[PDB]
Design a protein around this motif. Structure first.
Motif, short mmCIF file in Angstrom:
data_model
loop_
_atom_site.label_atom_id
_atom_site.label_comp_id
_atom_site.label_asym_id
_atom_site.label_seq_id
_atom_site.Cartn_x
_atom_site.Cartn_y
_atom_site.Cartn_z
N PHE A 18 0.92 -1.34 -0.08
CA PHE A 18 0.03 -0.07 -0.02
C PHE A 18 0.98 1.22 0.06
N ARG A 19 0.57 2.33 -0.73
CA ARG A 19 1.16 3.51 -1.09
C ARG A 19 1.28 4.47 0.18
N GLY A 20 0.40 4.29 1.12
CA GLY A 20 0.70 4.65 2.44
C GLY A 20 1.77 4.29 3.34
N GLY A 39 -4.67 7.87 -5.46
CA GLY A 39 -4.91 7.21 -4.20
C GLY A 39 -4.61 7.86 -3.10
N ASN A 40 -5.08 7.65 -1.99
CA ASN A 40 -4.54 8.39 -0.63
C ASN A 40 -3.33 7.89 -0.09
N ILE A 41 -2.69 8.72 0.70
CA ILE A 41 -1.44 8.21 1.33
C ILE A 41 -1.31 8.23 2.92
N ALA A 58 -16.58 7.85 0.46
CA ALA A 58 -15.48 8.23 0.46
C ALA A 58 -14.64 7.03 1.05
N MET A 59 -14.73 6.11 0.55
CA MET A 59 -13.92 4.62 0.79
C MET A 59 -12.51 5.18 0.24
N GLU A 60 -12.41 5.88 -1.02
CA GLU A 60 -11.10 5.98 -1.43
C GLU A 60 -10.14 7.10 -0.91
N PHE A 61 -10.92 7.84 0.33
CA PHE A 61 -10.34 8.73 1.22
C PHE A 61 -9.88 8.16 2.38
N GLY A 62 -10.04 6.64 2.60
CA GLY A 62 -9.59 6.04 3.88
C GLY A 62 -10.73 5.16 4.37
N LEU A 63 -11.52 4.65 4.09
CA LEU A 63 -12.62 3.75 4.18
C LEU A 63 -13.48 4.64 5.15
N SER A 100 -6.65 -5.64 4.64
CA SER A 100 -7.18 -4.63 4.80
C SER A 100 -7.29 -3.71 3.37
N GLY A 101 -7.54 -2.33 3.66
CA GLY A 101 -7.52 -1.57 2.54
C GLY A 101 -8.69 -1.58 1.72
N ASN A 102 -9.90 -2.01 2.51
CA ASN A 102 -11.28 -1.92 2.11
C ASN A 102 -12.22 -1.96 3.23
N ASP A 103 -13.70 -1.95 2.70
CA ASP A 103 -14.53 -1.44 3.74
C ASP A 103 -15.02 -2.38 4.88
N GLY A 162 -16.12 -11.44 4.83
CA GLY A 162 -15.93 -12.27 3.76
C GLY A 162 -15.84 -11.04 2.46
N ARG A 163 -14.89 -11.74 1.30
CA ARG A 163 -15.09 -10.80 0.25
C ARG A 163 -14.76 -11.94 -0.82
N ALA A 164 -15.02 -11.59 -2.17
CA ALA A 164 -14.94 -12.45 -3.51
C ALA A 164 -14.98 -11.64 -4.49
N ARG A 165 -14.02 -11.98 -5.37
CA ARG A 165 -14.08 -11.59 -6.87
C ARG A 165 -13.54 -12.19 -7.83
N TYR A 166 -13.54 -11.96 -9.20
CA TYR A 166 -12.88 -12.69 -10.22
C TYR A 166 -11.45 -12.07 -10.30
N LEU A 199 -4.93 -0.44 -15.12
CA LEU A 199 -5.47 0.85 -15.04
C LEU A 199 -6.04 1.24 -13.82
N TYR A 200 -5.61 0.49 -12.69
CA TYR A 200 -6.37 0.91 -11.36
C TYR A 200 -6.08 2.42 -11.19
N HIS A 201 -7.17 3.14 -10.74
CA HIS A 201 -7.26 4.41 -10.42
C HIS A 201 -6.86 5.53 -11.28
N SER A 202 -6.78 5.13 -12.40
CA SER A 202 -6.67 6.08 -13.42
C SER A 202 -8.01 6.37 -14.44
N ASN A 225 2.36 -3.37 5.11
CA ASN A 225 1.63 -3.27 3.99
C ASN A 225 0.32 -3.64 4.26
N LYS A 226 -0.37 -2.46 4.29
CA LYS A 226 -1.76 -2.43 4.96
C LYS A 226 -3.00 -3.32 3.98
N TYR A 227 -2.38 -3.63 2.93
CA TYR A 227 -3.35 -4.55 1.90
C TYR A 227 -3.14 -6.04 2.52
N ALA A 228 -1.98 -6.47 3.02
CA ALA A 228 -1.79 -7.88 3.43
C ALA A 228 -2.21 -8.23 5.10
#
Ligand SMILES: *[C@@H]1O[C@H](CO)[C@@H](O[C@@H]2O[C@H](CO)[C@@H](O[C@@H]3O[C@H](CO[C@H]4O[C@H](CO)[C@@H](O)[C@H](O)[C@@H]4O)[C@@H](O)[C@H](O[C@H]4O[C@H](CO)[C@@H](O)[C@H](O)[C@@H]4O)[C@@H]3O)[C@H](O)[C@H]2NC(C)=O)[C@H](O)[C@H]1NC(C)=O
Ligand SMILES: *[C@@H]1O[C@H](CO)[C@@H](O[C@@H]2O[C@H](CO)[C@@H](O[C@@H]3O[C@H](CO[C@H]4O[C@H](CO)[C@@H](O)[C@H](O)[C@@H]4O)[C@@H](O)[C@H](O[C@H]4O[C@H](CO)[C@@H](O)[C@H](O)[C@@H]4O)[C@@H]3O)[C@H](O)[C@H]2NC(C)=O)[C@H](O)[C@H]1NC(C)=O
Ligand SMILES: *[C@@H]1O[C@H](CO)[C@@H](O[C@@H]2O[C@H](CO)[C@@H](O[C@@H]3O[C@H](CO)[C@@H](O)[C@H](O)[C@@H]3O)[C@H](O)[C@H]2NC(C)=O)[C@H](O)[C@H]1NC(C)=O
Ligand SMILES: *[C@@H]1O[C@H](CO)[C@@H](O[C@@H]2O[C@H](CO)[C@@H](O[C@@H]3O[C@H](CO)[C@@H](O)[C@H](O)[C@@H]3O)[C@H](O)[C@H]2NC(C)=O)[C@H](O)[C@H]1NC(C)=O
Ligand SMILES: *[C@@H]1O[C@H](CO)[C@@H](O[C@@H]2O[C@H](CO)[C@@H](O)[C@H](O)[C@H]2NC(C)=O)[C@H](O)[C@H]1NC(C)=O
Ligand SMILES: *[C@@H]1O[C@H](CO)[C@@H](O[C@@H]2O[C@H](CO)[C@@H](O)[C@H](O)[C@H]2NC(C)=O)[C@H](O)[C@H]1NC(C)=O
Ligand SMILES: *[C@@H]1O[C@H](CO)[C@@H](O[C@@H]2O[C@H](CO)[C@@H](O)[C@H](O)[C@H]2NC(C)=O)[C@H](O)[C@H]1NC(C)=O
Ligand SMILES: *[C@@H]1O[C@H](CO)[C@@H](O[C@@H]2O[C@H](CO)[C@@H](O)[C@H](O)[C@H]2NC(C)=O)[C@H](O)[C@H]1NC(C)=O
Ligand SMILES: CC(C)C[C@H](OC(=O)N[C@@H](CCC(=O)O)C(=O)O)C(=O)O
Ligand SMILES: CC(C)C[C@H](OC(=O)N[C@@H](CCC(=O)O)C(=O)O)C(=O)O
Ligand SMILES: *[C@@H]1O[C@H](CO)[C@@H](O)[C@H](O)[C@H]1NC(C)=O
Ligand SMILES: *[C@@H]1O[C@H](CO)[C@@H](O)[C@H](O)[C@H]1NC(C)=O
Ligand SMILES: *[C@@H]1O[C@H](CO)[C@@H](O)[C@H](O)[C@H]1NC(C)=O
Ligand SMILES: *[C@@H]1O[C@H](CO)[C@@H](O)[C@H](O)[C@H]1NC(C)=O
Ligand SMILES: *[C@@H]1O[C@H](CO)[C@@H](O)[C@H](O)[C@H]1NC(C)=O
Ligand SMILES: *[C@@H]1O[C@H](CO)[C@@H](O)[C@H](O)[C@H]1NC(C)=O
Ligand SMILES: [Ca+2]
Ligand SMILES: [Ca+2]
Ligand SMILES: [Cl-]
Ligand SMILES: [Cl-]
Ligand SMILES: [Zn+2]
Ligand SMILES: [Zn+2]
Ligand SMILES: [Zn+2]
Ligand SMILES: [Zn+2]
Lengths: 693, 693
Positions: free
Chosen positions: B155-157, B202-204, B369-374, B463-466, B479-483, B494-497, B641-644
C-alpha cells in the motif's frame, strides 16, 4: 409452590448467625493458609447445599504484608537521634482473643519501604480541597514534609495520592474520635466505639479499576507475563502508616506553625490542631521518623464460584458476589455479608433439591483479596470478560450486611429502581415502631428521597467494592443493599480493626439477626426476580429521569463560567437533545414491552436482550481520560474519592478547577470534547431501544 | 418456491451490465455533487426494488482535493532556477471523454502543501526491506532527499510512512511498466494496459483503522468536536505526487550515484535504475522540485443504508456493503461491485414482493469516501457500534467484482470456509473449458490450496477495504470474493486511472458479464445462506486448523533466535496449549450443534449466539500496540503493507527485526507479553464454545 415467597420463607436468621460465628473465629487474611481453608470449606458446603458445580478459580497477584521480624512504627526523635516516643506495634487484642495467632498488625497495604524523618504538616482529611486550602490560601508548602491526616470523608488511597502530589515524603493516617467515636457510646468491648489503641487497616492503592497491579487487562494466571514493580499500576511512592488516637495525640500535641484555618479542621482530641510545619519552639528540633518495612509479594488467591444452571436461559447469568478475605476477624466486613450469601445459597439449593431451577443461570461468588484492591473479582472478570459481556444480566454485591441498625441503604443502577421499590413493598420491616408495615414504608420514612415525595433515597454506585469491574468496566447492571446508620464514606467506628468481631455484631448491632435477615431478603429477592422474571425487571424510563437530572447538574457547574462559555462557544444543546431523545425512545420501548405478543419468545428475548444490553451501551471502549478501565460514560468513581459515584465524569473532570488551568482554550476544548462524547453515548444507548429493523 | 435457487436464478448478467453503464458515465468523486446525486438515485431505486427502508447517513469528514487554479506538478530545475522539464497537469482523456468535466487530475490525497527542491534517491518499491537495503547495506542516506518510488507490492501509505522515517523531504510515486504493462497486450483504448501518460490516484494516509482523521472513535456528526490538523490521525508530513512512466523516464534517466544493488531493483524502462543521490556529472547541478498545493477540507459524505427486515430474527444483521465513490469513472473500482450489489438488491426485492422475507435482517450499504480512507463505512460503524457488536452476524464486502478473468478469489474468516466450499460446489463455472462443471471445480484447479489437495486457496483478510472496521475493530465475521488474474497488491494496470471506464470492462474484461454474474452469485449466495440458514453457516473447527498453522508459523520465526529464546526463557507452550484446547472444545461444540434438540429454539439461538460471538471473542478491547482500532488478536493488517493480512500480529511485530533492537531484554520481554495475550485470547475464545452452565 416454588415462587419467590418459598425462597424468602426458607431464609433463617438463626442460620445466618451460625454461619457468621463459623466464619469469624480466626483471621482470614488474603493469601494466607486460613483463608484457603475457608475457601475449601465454602466450596464443600455450596456443593452439599445443592449447586450444580462449585470450583475454585485461583490467580497469583501482588499482595503486601508487614515483616514479622522487623515491625513498622513511627517515632518522635530528638536532635541526638534518640527515639523518645514510639507508636504501638499492635492493637490490644479483645477479650478472649489475646491468644489468637496471626493477627496482622496495623499497616497500610502496598506502602513502600523507607525511614523518612522530618517535620509534620497536618492536612485535615487530606482531600483535594484541604490541599487547595493549605497551598493556595494558607501558603503552606508540604514538599519534603511528613503529612498527618485524619481518616474519613474519602478513600484513603485518594489521601495518599493527594499527599504525593503535594510533595510529601510520608503520610501518617489516624482515626480521630470526631469521626470514629459516637457521643455517649462506650469503647469496645463495652460498646461499639473505637478505643484509643484501635487502628484502621486498609490498602492505599490508586488502581482505577485495573485489578492486580502487575497484570492490567489480563488474568493473573499461570503463564501471565508481569510488569516489573516500577511499571506496576497504582502503587504509592512514599511510606504510609495508620495509627490510633492515643498515638495521634502524642504526635499532634506538640504541633506549631499556623493555627487551623477554621473549625472544620478541628477534631475532638485535646490538641490545637495546628497545621505546622513542625513543633512549637521548645520542641522545634525534634522530628518525626517513620519505619516501614512491609514487602510486596506475588501470592496465590482463591475465588469460590458456584453455578445453579438455568432451566430456560442457561446462557444468561445473574451473579451474587461478595468477598471472603478480611483484615482480621471480619465480624462485619465481610463476614456479615458472606453469612448472608451462604444462607441464600442454602435456600436456593433447598428449592433445587425439590426439583425447581431458576429461569436464568445464577452464579455465586466468594471473592478473595478484595481488601488488597478488588483483586479476586477483577481477575476473574478479566478471565471471563467475553462471557460476561455477552451473557451478564446483573451483578448483586454482598459485602457487609450491616453498618448500622437504622434503615435500609440501596445503591444501584437506575435500571433496578422499580425492582427495588416493588420488592421492598412486599417485605416486612424489621424496625421498632414499624411492626406490620412494609420495609418500603420504614425505609421511605427514615430515608426520604431528596427529589420525590413518598419515595426512598437510592444512591449512585460509587466504588471501593467488588461490583466495580462488572459495572464500570463491563457495563453489567449492578446493585448493593445493606442496613445502615442515620459521613457514610468514613466507615463505622471499628471498621478494619481487630475489634470487628462476632461479639461486636451479636451484642451491639443485631442481636436477633433480624437486620441480617432483612438484607438477605433484599439481596436474595433481587437475585430471584432477576433470574426468574419472564421479562427482565429493568425499567429504562428510570434511566431517562436520572439522565436529565445529571445533565442539569453538569450544565449548572459549567454555568458558573458564563464568560468562558461565550468565548469558547460551549453548548450543552447536544447533551440535552440526546437526553430528550432517550426519554422519547424509552417511552416507546416501554409501550412495546407492555404490548408485544406475549406468546412470542423471540420478541421476548429480543426485548430481554435490549434490556440487558442497555447498561452495556453506556460503555465507551476507549475508557475515560487516563483511566482506561473506567469505561461507563454516565458513572465513574470520583477522581477525588473512590467511594463516591460521579455522574457525567468525563465532563465533570474536564470542568473541575478549570479556572486554575493555564491554557483556557485547551481546557474548554476538552470540556466540549467530553460533551460530544456524552451526547453521542446517550444517543447511541437510546438507539439500542429503537425498533431493531 | 422461495429458496436460494430462486434468488440465484433471478440475477441477470444483462441487468449488471445496464447498471454498470449507468454508474460510470460521469465521475463520482467523494464529496462532489455528482456523487450526492448518485446516492439519491440509488436510494430511490432500492426503495422501488422493495426494501423496507432506505436512508442516507451523512457525516462531515476531512477530504483532500487539488487546487483547480494552482495545479500540482514536478520539475527538473537547472542551477539558474529555470524549469526545464515539467510533469503533466492531467492524463490524456480517453476517446469520447475528452469533453467530460470534473475529472480530478492525478494527485496523492492528503499530501501537505510544499515546494521542496533537492536531489533524487530511487528506493525501488519503498518497502521496509528496500529501506533496510539502502541504509544498512548500501549506506545511502535519504535525509533531506526527494525519494522516487515505483508503485506496487505494498500500500502506497506504507511507502510514504517509510520514506518519512528515512528522513525524505518529498516522495514521487510512479507506475513502472514492469508492474503495470503486461507483455503482449496493447495500451488503452486498444487493450487493458497502462499508457505512458496514465497515472494512479490514491490516498497516502496511515489511519490504522481510525476512519475520519479528525474524529477517531466517534462519528463525524453535526455536533462532533474535531481535532485540530496538527493532532489529526494519519496525515503525511512531506509532499507526495504520482506520475506516469513517460514522466518517470525523464526523472530517472539522468540518475547517478550507486548502481542498483540487483535485478529486483530494475523495472522495464530504458534507464539504469541508479539509486542516486542526484544526477550523473553533466547534470549534477540540476535538481528536482515538487509543487503541491492540494488542500484538506471537511466535506459532507453520504452512505445509502437499505434494510430488509428479518421475519424471525430481525435483531440479527447480515450486511452486504461496498463503496460508491470513485476516483474518476470507476469502471472497475467500485462500480463493477456496486452494479453487482444493485442486482442483488433487485433480486432480494423480487422475492420480497412475492411475500418472502429472510430469517435474519439484511442490511445493504453503498459507502462513501472509501477512496479517502474507508471513511464512510468507518464513521457509520462508529455511530452504530453497539448495535453491530451485539447483533452483527456477518459482513460481506462488495468492491470491484473483477480484477482479471482467470479464476475466483475469496478472502475471509476461517468461519466461512465451509460455507464458501459448499456454495461454490452448487454454482456453475463461467470459465472456458469448464462448461457443465462447478465453480468449485474450476477454482480448485486454477487456484489450488498450498496445504490441501483437492481444495482451493482462500486467503486471509488483509485491509484497504470497507470490511476493516467490521472485522478488525468490531470482530464481525467478514468475507470478500471477486474474479481475479493468474503481484496481487499492485492492482490491475488501469487501477485508479482515468482509463478505468465502462469500455474497459465491456471490451477487455467481461464482454458477456458472465464473471460479474458469477461474483453476484457468490456474494449474494453467501448473504442468502447467512441470513436464512436455521443454524448459522459457520464451522468453528476451521478456525482451530488455522490457529495451529499460525502458531507453527510464529514459533518458526522466533526459532531463528535460539540463543535469545534460551536467555530470556521464551516459551510458546501456552499458545500451543490454548490452540490444543480450542481444537478440543470446538470439536465438542460441533458434536452438540449436530445433536442438540432441533425442536428447541432457545438452545438453537444460544448455539447461534455462540457461533456469532466466536469471531467477537478474538477482540481485545485494549487493541494492538499503538494501533487501538486494530483489536483482533489473530488478524491485523500488516504494519508493512496495509493490504496484506498478518496472523498473530502482536507477536509478529514484537519479533520483527528484533536482532536490531538495542535492549534485547526489553524486546524479548515484549515478545513474551504478546505470547501471553495471544494464548489468553485463544483460550478465552475457546471457552465461549464450552457448555454455558
Ligand atoms: C435527537 O433525535 C433527532 C431526531 O428526531 C435528531 O435530529 C437530527 O438532527 C440533526 C441536526 O443536528 C439533523 O441533521 C441535519 O440533517 C439535514 C438533512 O436531513 C435530511 O436528510 C437525512 C439524510 O441525509 C435524513 O436522515 C433526514 O431525515 C432529513 O430528511 C442536513 O441538511 C442538516 O445540515 C445542514 O444544517 C446544519 C445546521 O444548520 C449545517 O451545519 C449544515 O452545514 C447543513 O447546512 C443537518 O445535518 C437530522 O436531519 C435530524 N434527523 C431527523 C429529524 O430525523 C437529533 O440529532 C438527535 N440528537 C442527537 C444528540 O443525536
Ligand atoms: C488448556 O486446558 C487445560 C484443562 O484441560 C488447562 O489446564 C490447567 O492448567 C493449569 C497449568 O497451567 C493448571 O494450573 C495448576 O492448578 C493446580 C491446582 O489445580 C486444581 O485446583 C483448581 C482450583 O484451584 C482446579 O480448577 C483444578 O481442576 C485442580 O483440581 C495448581 O496446584 C498448580 O500450581 C502449582 O504448579 C505450578 C506449576 O508447577 C506452580 O507454578 C505453582 O506455584 C503451584 O505449585 C497450577 O496452577 C490447572 O489445574 C489446569 N486445569 C485443569 C486440568 O482443569 C490449561 O491451562 C489450558 N491452557 C490454557 C493456555 O489456558
Ligand atoms: C413494579 O410494579 C408495578 C405495579 O404492579 C409494575 O407496573 C405495572 O406492570 C404491569 C405489567 O406490565 C402493567 O400492566 C399492563 O398495562 C398495560 C396498559 O394498561 C396493558 O396493555 C398490559 O396488558 C398490562 O396489563 C401495569 O400498567 C404497570 N403499572 C404501573 C406502571 O403503574 C412494574 O412493572 C413493576 N416493576 C418491575 C417488574 O420492574
Ligand atoms: C457443507 O456441507 C457439508 C456436507 O453436506 C455439511 O456437513 C454435513 O452436515 C450435516 C448436517 O449437520 C451432517 O449430518 C449430521 O450428521 C450427524 C452424525 O452423523 C447426525 O447425528 C445428524 O443428525 C446429521 O444427520 C453431516 O454429517 C455433515 N457432513 C460432513 C461434515 O461431511 C456442512 O455442514 C456444510 N457446511 C455449512 C452448512 O457451513
Ligand atoms: C465451621 O463449620 C464447618 C462445617 O460444619 C466445620 O468444618 C467441619 O468440621 C468437622 C469437625 O472438625 C469435620 O469433620 C468436617 O470435615 C468439616 N467440614 C467442612 C465442610 O470443612 C468447621 O469446624 C467450623 N469452624 C469453626 C471455627 O467452628
Ligand atoms: C523506641 O524503639 C526504639 C527501637 O527499638 C528504641 O531504641 C533502641 O533502644 C535499644 C535499647 O536501648 C538500643 O540498643 C537500640 O540501638 C535503639 N534503636 C534505635 C533505632 O534507636 C527506643 O528506646 C524506643 N523508645 C521508647 C521511648 O520506648
Ligand atoms: C441512470 O439511471 C437512472 C434511473 O433509471 C436515471 O435517472 C432517471 O432519469 C429519468 C429521465 O431523466 C428521470 O425521469 C428519473 O427521475 C430518474 N430516476 C432516478 C431514480 O433518478 C439516470 O438518467 C441514468 N443515468 C445515466 C447517465 O444514464
Ligand atoms: C514549466 O512550468 C513553469 C511554470 O508555469 C514554467 O515557468 C514559467 O514560465 C513563464 C513564461 O515563460 C514565466 O512567466 C514564469 O515566471 C515561470 N514560472 C516559474 C515558476 O518558473 C516553465 O517554463 C515550464 N517549463 C517547460 C519546459 O515547459
Ligand atoms: C465502609 C465503606 C466506606 C467502604 C467498604 O469497602 C471497603 O472497605 N473497601 C476496601 C477496598 C477498596 C478498594 O481497594 O477499592 C477499602 O476501602 O479498603 C464498603 O463498601 O463496605
Ligand atoms: C487493488 C487492491 C490491491 C486494493 C483495492 O482497494 C483500494 O484501492 N483501496 C483504496 C483505499 C485503501 C485505504 O485507504 O485503506 C486504496 O488502496 O487506495 C481493492 O481492495 O480492490
Ligand atoms: C524481614 O526482616 C528480617 C530481619 O531484619 C530480614 O532478615 C528479612 O530479610 C526481612 N524479610 C523480608 C524482606 O521479606
Ligand atoms: C516548596 O518547597 C520546595 C523547596 O524545598 C520547592 O521546590 C517548591 O517550589 C516549593 N513550592 C512553593 C513555594 O510553592
Ligand atoms: C442500635 O439501635 C439503637 C436504637 O436506636 C441505638 O441506640 C444503637 O446506637 C444502635 N446500635 C448501633 C451499633 O448502631
Ligand atoms: C488556490 O489557488 C488560488 C490561485 O493561486 C488561490 O487564490 C486560492 O487561495 C487557492 N485555494 C485554496 C487554498 O483553497
Ligand atoms: C543523514 O544525514 C543527516 C545530515 O544531513 C544526519 O542528521 C543523519 O544522521 C545522517 N544519517 C546517517 C549518516 O546515517
Ligand atoms: C481475458 O481472458 C483471456 C483468455 O485467457 C486473456 O488472454 C485476456 O488477457 C483476459 N483479459 C484480461 C483483462 O485479463
Ligand atoms: Ca489482571
Ligand atoms: Ca470518526
Ligand atoms: Cl455491599
Ligand atoms: Cl471486495
Ligand atoms: Zn469488605
Ligand atoms: Zn474492608
Ligand atoms: Zn474500491
Ligand atoms: Zn479504489
Amino acid at each position: 409452590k416454588h415462587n419467590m415467597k418459598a425462597f424468602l420463607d426458607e431464609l433463617k436468621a438463626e442460620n445466618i448467625k451460625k454461619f457468621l460465628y463459623n466464619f469469624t473465629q480466626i483471621p482470614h487474611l488474603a493469601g494466607t493458609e486460613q483463608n484457603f481453608q475457608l475457601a475449601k470449606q465454602i466450596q464443600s458446603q455450596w456443593k452439599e447445599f445443592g449447586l450444580d458445580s462449585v470450583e475454585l478459580a485461583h490467580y497469583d497477584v501482588l499482595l503486601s504484608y508487614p515483616n514479622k521480624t522487623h515491625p513498622n512504627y513511627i517515632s518522635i526523635i530528638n536532635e541526638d537521634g534518640n527515639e523518645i516516643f514510639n507508636t504501638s506495634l499492635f492493637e490490644p487484642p479483645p477479650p478472649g482473643y489475646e491468644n489468637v495467632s496471626d493477627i496482622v498488625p496495623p499497616f497500610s497495604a502496598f506502602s513502600p519501604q523507607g525511614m523518612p524523618e522530618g517535620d509534620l504538616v497536618y492536612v485535615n482529611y487530606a482531600r483535594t480541597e484541604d490541599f487547595f486550602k493549605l497551598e493556595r490560601d494558607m501558603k503552606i508548602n508540604c514538599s519534603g514534609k511528613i503529612v498527618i491526616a485524619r481518616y474519613g470523608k474519602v478513600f484513603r488511597g485518594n489521601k495518599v495520592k493527594n499527599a504525593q502530589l503535594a510533595g510529601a515524603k510520608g503520610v501518617i493516617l489516624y482515626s480521630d474520635p470526631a469521626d470514629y467515636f459516637a457521643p455517649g457510646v462506650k469503647s469496645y468491648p463495652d460498646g461499639w466505639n473505637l478505643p484509643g489503641g484501635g487502628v484502621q487497616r486498609g490498602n492505599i492503592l490508586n488502581l482505577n479499576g485495573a485489578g492486580d497491579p502487575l497484570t492490567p487487562g489480563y488474568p493473573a494466571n499461570e503463564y501471565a507475563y508481569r510488569r516489573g514493580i516500577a511499571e506496576a499500576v497504582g502503587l504509592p511512592s512514599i511510606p504510609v502508616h495508620p495509627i490510633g488516637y492515643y498515638d495521634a495525640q502524642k504526635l499532634l500535641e506538640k504541633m506549631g506553625g499556623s493555627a487551623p484555618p477554621d473549625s472544620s479542621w478541628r477534631g475532638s482530641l485535646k490538641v490545637p490542631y495546628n497545621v505546622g510545619p513542625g513543633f512549637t519552639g521548645n520542641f522545634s528540633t525534634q522530628k518525626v521518623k517513620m519505619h516501614i518495612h512491609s514487602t510486596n509479594e506475588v501470592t496465590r488467591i482463591y475465588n469460590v464460584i458456584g453455578t445453579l444452571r438455568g432451566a430456560v436461559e442457561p446462557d444468561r447469568y445473574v451473579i451474587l458476589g461478595g468477598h471472603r478475605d478480611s483484615w482480621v476477624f471480619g465480624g462485619i466486613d465481610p463476614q456479615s455479608g458472606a453469612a448472608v450469601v451462604h444462607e441464600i445459597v442454602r435456600s436456593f439449593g433447598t428449592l433445587k433439591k425439590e426439583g425447581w431451577r431458576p429461569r436464568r443461570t445464577i452464579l455465586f461468588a466468594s471473592w478473595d483479596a478484595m481488601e488488597f484492591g478488588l483483586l479476586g473479582s477483577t481477575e476473574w472478570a478479566e478471565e471471563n470478560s467475553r462471557l460476561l459481556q455477552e451473557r451478564g444480566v446483573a451483578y448483586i454485591n454482598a459485602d457487609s450486611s450491616i453498618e448500622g441498625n437504622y434503615t435500609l441503604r440501596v445503591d444501584c443502577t437506575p435500571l433496578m429502581y422499580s425492582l427495588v421499590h416493588n420488592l421492598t413493598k412486599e417485605l416486612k420491616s424489621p424496625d421498632e415502631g414499624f411492626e406490620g408495615k412494609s420495609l418500603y414504608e420504614s425505609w421511605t420514612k427514615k430515608s426520604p428521597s431528596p427529589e420525590f415525595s413518598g419515595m426512598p433515597r437510592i444512591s449512585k454506585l460509587g466504588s471501593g467494592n467488588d461490583f466495580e469491574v462488572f459495572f464500570q468496566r463491563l457495563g453489567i447492571a449492578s446493585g448493593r443493599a445493606r442496613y445502615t446508620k442515620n459521613n457514610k464514606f468514613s466507615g463505622y467506628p471499628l471498621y478494619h480493626s481487630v475489634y470487628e468481631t462476632y461479639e461486636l455484631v451479636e451484642k451491639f448491632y443485631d442481636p436477633m439477626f433480624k437486620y441480617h435477615l432483612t438484607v438477605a431478603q433484599v439481596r436474595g429477592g433481587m437475585v430471584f426476580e432477576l433470574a426468574n422474571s419472564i421479562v427482565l425487571p429493568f425499567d429504562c424510563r428510570d434511566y431517562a429521569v436520572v439522565l436529565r437530572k445529571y445533565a442539569d447538574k453538569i450544565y449548572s457547574i459549567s454555568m458558573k463560567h458564563p464568560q468562558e462559555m461565550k468565548t469558547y462557544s460551549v453548548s450543552f444543546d447536544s447533551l440535552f437533545s440526546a437526553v430528550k431523545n432517550f426519554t422519547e425512545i424509552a417511552s416507546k420501548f416501554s409501550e412495546r414491552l407492555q404490548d408485544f405478543d406475549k406468546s412470542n419468545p423471540i420478541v421476548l428475548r429480543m426485548m430481554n436482550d435490549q434490556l440487558m444490553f442497555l447498561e452495556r451501551a453506556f460503555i465507551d471502549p476507549l475508557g475515560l481520560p487516563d483511566r482506561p478501565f473506567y469505561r461507563h460514560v454516565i458513572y465513574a468513581p470520583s477522581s477525588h474519592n473512590k467511594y463516591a459515584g460521579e455522574s457525567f465524569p468525563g465532563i465533570y473532570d474536564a470542568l473541575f478547577d478549570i479556572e486554575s488551568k493555564v491554557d483556557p482554550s485547551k481546557a474548554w476544548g476538552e470540556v466540549k470534547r467530553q460533551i460530544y462524547v456524552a451526547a453521542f453515548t446517550v444517543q447511541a444507548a437510546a438507539e439500542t431501544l429503537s425498533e431493531v429493523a
